[PDB]
């Protein structure tokens, strides 16, 4: 019962083996390594810890590469610093140069291009805005209106509202980046200002040069890719929702709305969506978060979140530990008062008809009515862990896999448990494997209801395509069952009339040798009955059906067989009785 | 696509084997045996005939026989007919008397115990009324006011409009005729003038001595019936509606209501109907049934009732087959112009929640949604078969069974047709053979989807417990696709540009070696298109996504292998290719 | 369109006359006043400057009072600020003494009879928490173990988590500003610490003895409040859910599921809420708000809530019209992108059947199918404009009324703009004032379809008892109209057949004297037709039926009144042509 992924950046807080394993301890599902900054050679270094403490602790944890991306600095500026006045105007040069509160250059020299008189341009993540007066083609210098007065160190950002920004996909240097998570066998690549399908397929044809098998996550960060949101996820495994830059380039006030519909749009897919960035900020420096960001994390979750990211917190705060600690405890909370009849009415109406997506709604509605404890989700990829996932179950869901680095793609998907178990052949043996790793779990003991799904044959697999209802074992009697309903409660072994006359209340089941009109009086009294012998016309059998009362006859030794005081559960169709609670 | 079953009454018109031949070819399903007339001697010779041509035709026909009842009869009258005045008085006798308009003896000597004052009493099956004047148990015997003065003959029926009439659950012959019954391991046991609990138990413990396994369907005649419907199918295995009978003791205007309430109270807990008595009656005469008639039989359909009965048409009367084929039309036609989708709709509200039915309402669905070929049931006992067939599906309804009696019982059930194939053991043979089965009935090729319920393991079976969706085999080639869509068209191998420059419509999925840029003008106005090799961004990969076309890439041999102007269907995820035509 | 409204805080930021004004302007419906600080002096100073400032702009503005409450302070402390140790112990006495880390005093001295050991005890807003270790009723002291060590100053609040906290329901203080509330018809007021019924009707009590008439909301702070809302809700006027007070006593990570239910149950009664505090809070400090804030504010709107309140963003912060612009500006945004089917649908299912409610869901579903502009609610109470409220409609509600006072009670009320025009007394009046004033809002023009709803007749009134739907006027031409169906499209007067020959598009509905054979081939390329005579089996009137194009004929002077080239709608049930667009 956990359900939302809890990502972290790693950073010199949280190198340490010792911090690690807390943190592993702590919830953390998928460790971020920002590649903004950092050499190889450290992220190498951290990768070898996690993994290390990973398979000592016996855990699953993947590890996410985020790429630094392209971007539109400033060039270098005189004396370090410059300012600007607030009714004035400043030339943004193509060519390089020194800052002057005139002349000022920035490094992507094709802005004179996207850009238009009009247009907006925003500087040291949006400190003080700009706004093109006037476009020189022959000196390459666009000439602008200052307005929000201020200072502007060197190497400082630039974004243009929206805009076609015309960079690459990706840089050089994630080119190169890419390439090492291919040659740590990393699980994630979080893609950076991802904004057309162009960008991610730059990363996947990469990736299919040396067969790599990683999932890619844009990054969304501008009005294009909000605009490009289903085409993206078309060509991507999944998303990340940076809202810090995101509220640089389209209004905070705005943000929200924009998010929620992200979510959702990647809920219809079945793409895992990780909320990012501005959650537990004040852990950094505090040892508990405020409100303001516990309502924040919440709403990541009601709006519909596979997953949430730890950034600085973790990476180069104080309170780590803690920070994932209380993390998982605002989710635990978001989640326990939320109403998972809602959750699946919202995504029966969302998601479309296909053969797949049948059977989760028919493993989700399902799930919702018997009220099963668990839906072990028998996978090769990962798809049917998703297909499940998707439909936002009560139940646990429970992805067994044969391959370790798809239990790792699992790691990151809402509700899923992922273990790995050595792959069967036979359906047959498909779902006996299901039976036991769902209880070896502790997840489920034999009372409890289990839905199977799985794609059969597991040759061909792609699609997921059925699913078993199965009851966790496993009748202590039978015989033949008298009536259709059902009820528990504990025994009272009657070897005869007397054997129950003064101490008797009602929430038992009787279990005698057979009714005679000395019976007949303390059976209506009861919950159930268990008879020795018997047919279905007998006085045992009649009793039962008139009166209302559950009841099985025919049962081979119950007074010998069947414990006194002990609880007991009886089925009357099927003629089953069970251990102690069933269904 | 015939779904309505036909049960035939076997008579002197229908003996010859000859006859049962035209009317097994004419769409029987089951044949009633009545028990209320003819010796055990002649209705041995029928179900010999019966099987006999049954299993020359290799055709599954059930039998059913049918109870006479316990019955209030007028014992014999003097001269034979007797007549009574309108607004005059007439004592019943509980001791047996010779008729005259003033005394007047009745076979239920028990009559004054169940009557009162007020009470009405029906003579020769509602000719004429009298009703209670006075009671006098000293000369036991009950004084009453004639009302419809009429003629009266021996022998004639006497009906007590309920009234907790008193009489026994079944007779001494009845109980003799059925015990025949279970000599000729018989198929249903249709039981007369049903009314409690009681009046079923009583068949059923002549049944389970002998270990019978015969299922018992009510006639359900009276307001007693009527009342007590829900605990009657408690313990009964179907039902019968006989309108003729029920239409004496409650008014013919309001049958037809009284009829759609029972037919919905079986639909609810997935007991088969029979609606009875007055379907086709003229065609006892003639050879054409009457508007009126068609109407009636019709409605039967419109309320939900798994089969249709012939009585009198066929046993005794002129055109029998024509009366078979007739009904069968009907039949067909009233439910080639219904709603599958309304009547599945009343159907997931009307039933309860349960195991059983979560598959139920799950393969009901999917079926209607991915617009499934068939439902092939496997079921040892008949149970999924029904549970599938309550819902009442579009798709075939297919039972694979390994025994000849089930096969038998399910005859009589909506929407299932049953095959007889030796029982596997593991699922996965199970699954393979269901597949088999369907093909083999030459109801679903190659480009169909196809349903697989069963009750895994089938040990237990008891409930049914799982299902598989399955697309019926088998791709032509596969590789690599690109974008997530389908469709279906009319290959066209291009081995140059040249190959398809002046010769083209749309329409078609071009199967080329790879795009060059003289390619890209006419892929953009194709419908498909499968290319030799390549990869993800290729160029042949990159025009479809952008311009939305499915296609699929890296398909081994493309050209040489897939032919020339073959419709063909394209599976962008997957990354599949089929024969023509799927899903 | 603008559905949520916006109550602000009044402070020493917002006296001022001309801030008053630019706040009224930036949308502000309702003036708070918090009683918690200033004299009636002050109080008073406002509340004449809102009046007048309000009646200048002609804008209708409530006056909310907001009381303090009763309280559970701390007495003084020792040297002014007092420590407490982490793992130490305290010791809370009854009886007032000087602060010290062992003897520590609080003013409600029958704490003591509330709490018991294990009860948790926070102190300075839950700053540091205790726990009950002993009870000593003879001492009346109670001994605490600390948790949380922290400083503690003066007279610092405590809060005991539910816990029946047994203060009374109102202050002495409390008793005498709500009667200064009488004193200046106040509109408003909502009551502090509320939660039980009790505590409202001694507000109430005070309220009827002058027969007072204003709106009562309790401010629901705690568990006791929580639990008990629906009889608090039986016996108020509205409600106000105060975040920032209830994430003390609740946790910060539960608040958000309660805010919704909250909210749920006041939609459900038709009861207004004010989501309360914490919504800008960063808006005292800068000009725009955060990105976590936004969200915040929005998720107020989503989980429904009638209006929405800025405390010390305008009171007392630098930004105020800033504040209440922004507030509006989220209110737009977070309304325009969501699904007034979905929000009916909801309400639909959850209120309850009544005569009253009958009306409401009959003008929320027609003002959907319709797509009506506005509803013009006309009250005297304001009831039916909340009635009508609570289904939320897209359409705009309009409360004409005749009372001054009821107009301030409907400012806070979701969706209703309310105006003042004197009584009508006959129905026939009251209809015809209703367009009248709708029409002279600017709302709607002569195109639109408004819907009628109030209680008639007006005397006994109380209830909401029809609805009249609306075409506002009043059709250009009549005549005959054949067909049944409507379009709208510009005229081409034709005079005759060459009159329109070259010069021809579709999108145009012509308007002759009568049909030809040279008129014909012209007429069925058209939109529409209106022709100046005929009759019913016509050239003109056959033509338009046969193919389908609505037409009017028998239109006295068509070729001479109606003018060429304007826009027109015709009407072919009906028979009625417009100015311009209709229904």
Redesign the interface.
């Known amino acids: 019962m956990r359900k939302t992924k809890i990502v972290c950046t790693i950073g010199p807080a949280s190198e340490s083996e010792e911090m690690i394993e807390k943190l592993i301890n702590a919830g953390m599902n998928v460790a971020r390594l920002n590649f903004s900054h950092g050499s190889h050679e450290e992220h190498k270094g951290r990768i070898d810890t996690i993994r290390k403490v990973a398979k000592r602790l016996d855990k699953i944890v993947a590890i996410l590469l985020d790429t630094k991306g392209p971007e539109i600095r400033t060039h270098n500026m005189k004396d370090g610093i410059i300012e600007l006045e607030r009714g004035n105007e400043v030339i943004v040069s193509m060519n390089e140069v020194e800052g002057t509160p005139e002349k000022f250059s920035v490094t992507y020299e094709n802005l004179i291009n996207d850009v238009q008189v009009g247009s907006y341009i925003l500087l040291d993540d949006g400190l003080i805005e700009l706004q093109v007066k006037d476009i020189d083609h022959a000196k390459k210098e666009v000439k602008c209106d200052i307005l929000n007065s201020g200072e502007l160190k060197n190497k400082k950002g630039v974004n243009l509202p929206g805009v076609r920004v015309s960079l690459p996909g990706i840089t050089e240097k994630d080119a190169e980046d890419i390439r090492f998570g291919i040659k740590e066998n990393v699980d994630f690549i979080a893609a950076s200002f991802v904004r057309r399908?162009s960008d991610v397929?730059e990363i996947?044809?990469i990736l299919?040069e040396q067969k790599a098998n990683i999932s890619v996550f844009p990054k969304i960060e501008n009005q294009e890719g909000i605009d490009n949101i289903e085409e993206i996820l078309?060509?991507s495994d999944g998303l990340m929702v940076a809202?810090g830059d995101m509220?640089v380039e389209i209004?905070?006030?705005?943000?929200?709305?924009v998010?929620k519909?992200l979510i959702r749009q990647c809920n219809k897919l079945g793409k895992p969506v990780i909320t990012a960035t501005?959650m537990l900020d004040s852990m950094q420096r505090n040892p508990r978060a405020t409100?303001?960001?516990?309502?924040?994390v919440?709403?990541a979750i009601?709006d519909g979140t596979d997953a949430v990211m730890l950034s600085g917190e973790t990476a180069a705060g104080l309170y780590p530990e803690e920070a994932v600690k209380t993390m998982r405890?605002?989710a635990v909370?978001?989640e326990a008062?939320?109403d998972y009849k809602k959750l699946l009415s919202d995504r029966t109406k969302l998601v479309e008809?296909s053969?797949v997506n049948?059977?989760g709604?028919?493993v989700a509605?399902?799930a919702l009515?018997?009220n099963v404890k668990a839906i072990v989700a028998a996978t090769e990829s990962g798809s049917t862990a998703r297909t499940i996932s998707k439909y936002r179950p009560h139940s646990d869901i429970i992805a067994v896999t044969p391959s370790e680095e798809t239990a790792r793609q699992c790691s990151i998907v809402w509700g899923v448990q992922p273990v790995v178990k050595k792959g069967r052949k036979?359906?047959?043996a498909l779902?006996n494997n299901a039976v036991a790793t769902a209880v070896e779990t502790g997840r489920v003991t034999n009372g409890d209801?289990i839905i199977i799904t799985a794609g059969?044959?597991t040759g061909e697999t792609?699609?997921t395509?059925?699913?078993?209802?199965?009851?966790v074992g496993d009748e202590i009697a039978n015989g033949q069952g008298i009536?259709?309903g059902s009820v528990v409660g504990t025994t009272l072994v009657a070897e005869t009339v007397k054997d129950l006359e003064g101490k008797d209340l009602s929430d038992k089941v009787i279990v005698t040798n057979s009714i005679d009109e000395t019976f007949v009086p303390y059976v209506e009294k009861a919950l159930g009955l268990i008879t020795e012998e018997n047919?279905?016309?007998s006085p045992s059998a009649?009793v039962g059906?008139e009166k209302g009362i559950p009841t099985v006859v025919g049962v081979e030794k119950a007074v010998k067989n069947i414990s006194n005081n002990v609880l007991v559960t009886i089925d009357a169709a099927?003629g089953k009785i069970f251990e102690g609670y069933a269904?």
Chains 1, 2, 3 share one sequence.
């Not at 409100?291 to 924040?296: F, P, V």
């Not at 395509?465 to 009851?471: C, F, S």
């Open positions: 399908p397929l996947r044809e299919e078309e060509v809202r509220g209004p905070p006030e705005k943000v929200p709305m998010q519909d501005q409100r303001a960001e516990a309502s924040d919440a709403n009601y405890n605002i909370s978001a008062a939320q008809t053969l049948a059977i709604i028919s509605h399902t009515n018997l036979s359906t047959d779902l209801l059969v044959p792609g699609t395509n059925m699913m078993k209802i199965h009851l009536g259709r047919g279905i016309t009649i059906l099927q269904n």
